[PDB]
Design a protein around this ligand. Structure first.
Ligand SMILES: C[C@@H](O[C@H]1O[C@H](CO)[C@@H](O)[C@H](O)[C@@H]1O)[C@H](N)C(=O)O
Ligand code: CL
Ligand code: CL
Length: 138
């Protein structure tokens, strides 16, 4: 078994979402995070050349970061209360892609199995991001 799951980080509000089928389009190539004053509003992840369907609300500013070719996320940390507040994506190229506000319950996600990276994300959303889950695989 190479696959592993980190989470669920957050509360049980909003509605379930999963990017489980999105991993077929390719590896994670870019990240979109909408963030307001306190919370993380929305999430959107680019798998290969295809962007996922947007999950979350509209009340916030969009932040977009493209990843280098062959660069994959190897650690995910962040903070939350009832809703997700912070996200930091650590890549194998030694980059720390930080989004959101530095306040709340901390978490630090690492892959359980050898040589595995972040392949897709899941969680709960509504008008904000209620919870996030990290899925690791080869
Ligand atoms: C307060 C908020 O409610 C929506 O968004 C939250 C956070 O994403 C969810 O927990 C709720 O289930 C709901 O979808 C809106 N401002 C609202 O009043 O609808
Ligand atoms: Cl699960
Ligand atoms: Cl697209």
């Amino acid at each position: 078994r190479s696959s592993s799951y980190s989470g669920e980080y957050g509360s049980g509000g909003g509605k379930r979402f999963s990017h489980s089928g999105n991993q077929l389009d390719g590896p994670i190539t870019a990240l979109r995070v909408r963030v307001n004053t306190y919370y993380i509003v929305g999430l959107q992840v680019r798998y290969g050349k295809v962007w996922s369907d947007y999950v979350g609300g509209r009340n916030g500013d969009l932040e977009e970061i493209f990843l280098h070719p062959g660069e994959s996320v190897i650690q995910v940390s962040g903070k939350y209360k009832w809703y997700l507040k912070k996200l930091v994506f650590v890549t194998d190229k030694g980059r720390y892609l930080s989004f959101g506000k530095d306040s709340g319950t901390s978490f630090n996600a690492v892959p359980l199995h050898p040589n595995t990276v972040l392949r897709f994300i899941s969680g709960r959303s509504g008008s904000l991001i209620d919870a996030i889950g990290l899925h690791w695989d080869v």
